[PDB]
Ligand binder design. Structure first.
Ligand SMILES: NC(=[NH2+])c1cc2cccnc2s1
Ligand SMILES: [Ca+2]
Length: 223
């Protein structure tokens, strides 16, 4: 996250860190047994780490649970990143408490102008590399689809939306992949892609979760 702030330990209780020996993607807890992340974050051998703040220090509120199965969307296209969403089932149910909570799925899509909260442990420099150990947060609005499509001609589908600032300065970045974009108490997006980080007229692109609620609900009830 570039131009954001330190969230505060466990102030984003649904935030997840996917670990395969190191942190490589974020995710969101939707109920005690399931996590939603980005399909481009798919790997075999994932351990989900809940209740984390500093990912390099065991502070006492973490739960490390291995994944029993991963399901990448049936229509994920790695070349265009269309349908960039995946579900991960935990081997054991997590214990929900104040520091580990799940986030709600949306009932309808959010409107341009709505302010959201984006979080993650990704790079904090637009021109450089500095990975933080504690969770960073960024409040950003959803942009109009026309400004999103003008920045990325022929690349945005109806399953994506842009959020951020066209002036540049504040944005999600590498390492933030798979993490949450929460607006009005619902999970509306997943950090998916962009061009550089915090560049002018190059906002971040997010998977539009409101288009996948039926697929999510149906898949978790049959697995
Ligand atoms: N600028 C963004 N919002 C980006 C997010 C990601 C996520 C993965 C890879 N590259 C990028 S750029
Ligand atoms: Ca920790």
């Amino acid at each position: 996250i570039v131009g954001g702030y330190t969230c505060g330990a466990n102030t984003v209780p649904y935030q997840v860190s996917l670990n395969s020996g190191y942190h490589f993607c974020g995710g969101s807890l939707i109920n005690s047994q399931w996590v939603v992340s980005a399909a481009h974050c798919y790997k075999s051998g994932i351990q989900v780490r809940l209740g984390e703040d500093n990912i390099n220090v065991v502070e006492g509120n973490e739960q490390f649970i291995s994944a029993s199965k991963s399901i990448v969307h049936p229509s994920y296209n790695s070349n265009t990143l269309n349908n960039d969403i995946m579900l991960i089932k935990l081997k054991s149910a997590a214990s929900l408490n104040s520091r580990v909570a799940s986030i709600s799925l949306p009932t309808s899509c959010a409107s341009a102008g709505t302010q959201c909260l984006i979080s993650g442990w990704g790079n904090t420099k637009s021109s450089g590399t500095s990975y933080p150990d504690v969770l960073k947060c960024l409040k950003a609005p959803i942009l109009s689809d026309s400004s999103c499509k003008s920045a990325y001609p022929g690349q945005i589908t109806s399953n994506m939306f842009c959020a951020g600032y066209l002036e540049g300065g504040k944005d999600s970045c590498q390492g933030d992949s798979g993490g949450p974009v929460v607006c009005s108490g619902k999970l509306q997006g997943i950090v998916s892609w962009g061009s550089g980080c915090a560049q002018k007229n190059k906002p971040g692109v997010y998977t539009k979760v409101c288009n996948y609620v039926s697929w999510i609900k149906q898949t978790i009830a049959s697995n």
